[PDB]
Swiss-Prot record:
The entry's keywords: Differentiation, Hydrolase, Lipid degradation, Lipid metabolism, Meiosis, Membrane, Mitochondrion, Mitochondrion outer membrane, Oogenesis, Transmembrane, Transmembrane helix
Domain PLD phosphodiesterase, chain residue ranges per copy: 80-118
Entry comment, domain topic: In contrast to other members of the phospholipase D family, contains only one PLD phosphodiesterase domain, suggesting that it has a single half-catalytic and requires homodimerization to form a complete active site.
Effect of D130E: In strain: =MEL01, MEL02, MEL11, MEL12, MEL14, MEL15, MEL16, MEL17, MEL18, MEL19, MEL20, ZBMEL82, ZBMEL95, ZBMEL131, ZBMEL145, ZBMEL157, ZBMEL186, ZBMEL191, ZBMEL229, ZBMEL377, ZBMEL384 and ZBMEL398
Organism: Drosophila melanogaster (Fruit fly)
GO biological process, one term: regulatory ncRNA-mediated gene silencing
Subunit comment: Homodimer. Interacts with miga/CG12125.
Lineage: Eukaryota, Metazoa, Ecdysozoa, Arthropoda, Hexapoda
Superkingdom of the organism of origin: Eukaryota
Protein name: Mitochondrial cardiolipin hydrolase
Bilayer disposition of the protein: Single-pass membrane protein
Gene knockout outcome: Defects in mid oogenesis. Females are viable but produce eggs with a range of dorso-ventral patterning defects. Flies lay few eggs, all of which are completely ventralized and often collapsed. Effects are due to defects in piRNA biogenesis and derepression of retrotransposons. Defects are not only present in germ cells but also in somatic cells of the ovary.
Protein location: Mitochondrion outer membrane
Positions on the Cytoplasmic side per record topology: 5-151
């Protein structure tokens, strides 16, 4: 229900607000203005953000991916199915990666939800279990390396 979704989105925005180093987001469609703005604020905070999404859904109405890509957020797209959408905040491997390329404490958080083909965030799970955050982060690294990267 809309209520459960709003509560879930609110919890996610809170995690985004706490992001220190990185946010990796794999999502089929991005329609949440609230989620986007939180990500926008993270970007302004110095957080490194990457987005993987679907080509059919980036030019859909209410798609917020357009404005994030305009701000410099790299968006990679397969052209042209996921078991779930997910967000990894400060993944261990990713933070260590950033640390090397650039020479503060944090803790990995993965948010996952059901894929919506048309913000909507039911079946939401938020966890810091490092085994899970690792598999998701590793999975993102793989998908990122594979693919259209939006100009």
């Amino acid at each position: 229900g809309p209520m459960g979704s709003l509560r879930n989105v609110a919890k996610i925005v809170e995690q985004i607000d706490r992001a220190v180093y990185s946010i990796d987001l794999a999502i089929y469609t991005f329609t949440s203005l609230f989620l986007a703005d939180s990500i926008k604020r993270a970007l302004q905070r110095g957080v490194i953000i990457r987005i993987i999404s679907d080509g059919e859904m980036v030019y859909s109405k209410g798609s917020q991916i357009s404005m994030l890509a305009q701000l410099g957020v790299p968006v990679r797209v397969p052209i042209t199915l996921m078991h779930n959408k997910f967000c990894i905040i400060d993944g261990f491997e990713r933070v260590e990666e950033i640390r090397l390329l650039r020479k503060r404490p944090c803790y990995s958080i993965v948010i996952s939800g059901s894929v919506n083909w048309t913000g909507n965030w039911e079946n939401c799970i938020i966890t810091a279990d490092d085994k899970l955050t690792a598999t998701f982060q590793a999975e993102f690294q793989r998908m990122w390396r594979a693919q259209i990267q939006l100009k």
